[PDB]
Amino acid sequence: DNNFYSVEIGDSTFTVLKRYQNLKPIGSGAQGIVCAAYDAILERNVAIKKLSRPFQNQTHAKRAYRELVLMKCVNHKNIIGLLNVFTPQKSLEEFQDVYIVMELMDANLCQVIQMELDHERMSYLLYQMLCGIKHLHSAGIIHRDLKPSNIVVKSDCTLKILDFGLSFMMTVTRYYRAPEVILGMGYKENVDLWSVGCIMGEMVCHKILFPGRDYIDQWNKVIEQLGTPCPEFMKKLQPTVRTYVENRPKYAGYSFEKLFPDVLFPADSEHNKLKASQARDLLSKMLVIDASKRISVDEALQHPYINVWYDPSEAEAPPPKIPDKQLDEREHTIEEWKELIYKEVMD
Numbered sequence: 322d323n324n325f326y327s328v329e330i331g332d333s334t335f336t337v338l339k340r341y342q343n344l345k346p347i348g349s350g351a352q353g354i355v356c357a358a359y360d361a362i363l364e365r366n367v368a369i370k371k372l373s374r375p376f377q378n379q380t381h382a383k384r385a386y387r388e389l390v391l392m393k394c395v396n397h398k399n400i401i402g403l404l405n406v407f408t409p410q411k412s413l414e415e416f417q418d419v420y421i422v423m424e425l426m427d428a429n430l431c432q433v434i435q436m437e438l439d440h441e442r443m444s445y446l447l448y449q450m451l452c453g454i455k456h457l458h459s460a461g462i463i464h465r466d467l468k469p470s471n472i473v474v475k476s477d478c479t480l481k482i483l484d485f486g487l488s489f490m491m492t493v494t495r496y497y498r499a500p501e502v503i504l505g506m507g508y509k510e511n512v513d514l515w516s517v518g519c520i521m522g523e524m525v526c527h528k529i530l531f532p533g534r535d536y537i538d539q540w541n542k543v544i545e546q547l548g549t550p551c552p553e554f555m556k557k558l559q560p561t562v563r564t565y566v567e568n569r570p571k572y573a574g575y576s577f578e579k580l581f582p583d584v585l586f587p588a589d590s591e592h593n594k595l596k597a598s599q600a601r602d603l604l605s606k607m608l609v610i611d612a613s614k615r616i617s618v619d620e621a622l623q624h625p626y627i628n629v630w631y632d633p634s635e636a637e638a639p640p641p642k643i644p645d646k647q648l649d650e651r652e653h654t655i656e657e658w659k660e661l662i663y664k665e666v667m668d
């Protein structure tokens with residue numbers, strides 16, 4: 322076009338608005354490739370995600386539609402903001418790709434996990450995650466898919482959640498899935514606190530807590546560390562699941578003192594010893610198999626480890642106004658999704 326130019330990013334073509342220069346690949350997902358770029362108008366670096374034929378199947382479509390809608394109506398410091406959205410295609414018939422422009426962050430949490438963090442940074446990152454989750458909950462959004470790769474960080478320790486979480490498609494969130502998602506029992510808002518527990522545990526010990534090769538192994542990994550759950554939990558399971566869970570080898574589990582010893586934390590000073598004890602107590606309330614006994618986001622935000630950062634403008638921010646049942650995920654055809662997405666892009 323006269324407003325667009327094309328650069329080759331591997332085996333992929335990025336056709337972007339001329340305002341975006343010096344494209345550099347920073348990552349890839351099932352949706353598409355992400356480039357760092359310089360925005361010459363705003364005079365700041367951005368991230369541009371290319372969504373190739375998002376309407377291609379119902380899974381990509383629902384995800385692309387939810388991403389577009391929620392990014393346009395949410396304005397919270399701990400949720401990635403939408404700077405721009407475009408398509409190089411001139412019409413619906415030619416419509417192929419969607420490009421989402423976001424603020425560029427310095428790293429994702431996978432990188433932070435490979436660092437020892439002092440409690441001030443650790444507790445501030447965790448506080449921000451919980452604010453972002455609490456904001457999603459206040460609008461009726463349960464993430465359910467939180468993992469370190471979808472959480473990004475800046476140099477000044479600011480944190481942002483990249484996606485809104487959410488079937489079959491062709492060509493690693495499982496480690497962070499709550500027992501109620503693993504055992505197909507339905508879920509509440511605190512399904513997200515299990516994922517925070519997984520992420521926090523990983524930020525402390527630098528290794529994936531429950532690295533199951535599948536859902537059966539995933540359950541086995543959970544029970545080995547935490548122990549076989551109460552009979553009160555077993556009674557909440559459907560008979561076919563209740564039989565499978567009850568017939569597994571029995572595990573006593575480990576105390577959080579053995580799972581997360583002082584050797585894994587800064588614990589030299591009296592300040593750090595107290596923080597390590599507080600961080601351990603928080604881990605023990607998040608990594609709870611039975612969701613009815615698990616910490617809520619608000620109790621987590623008010624926990625001694627977290628509450629030093631508590632700011633109601635962040636933790637009690639007015640909920641976003643999602644234009645009704647727009648994300649109910651009703652089945653649509655390939656062409657219906659193609660139209661719904663195009664209309665959201667064009668506005």
Ligand SMILES: NC(=O)Nc1cc(-c2ccccc2)sc1C(N)=O
Pocket residue numbers: 347348349350355368401423424425426427428429473483
């Ligand atoms: N540094 C870094 O990982 N940045 C980053 C990475 C993103 C990403 C999103 C999906 C897949 C692969 C990478 S989006 C984004 C951003 N907005 O800063």
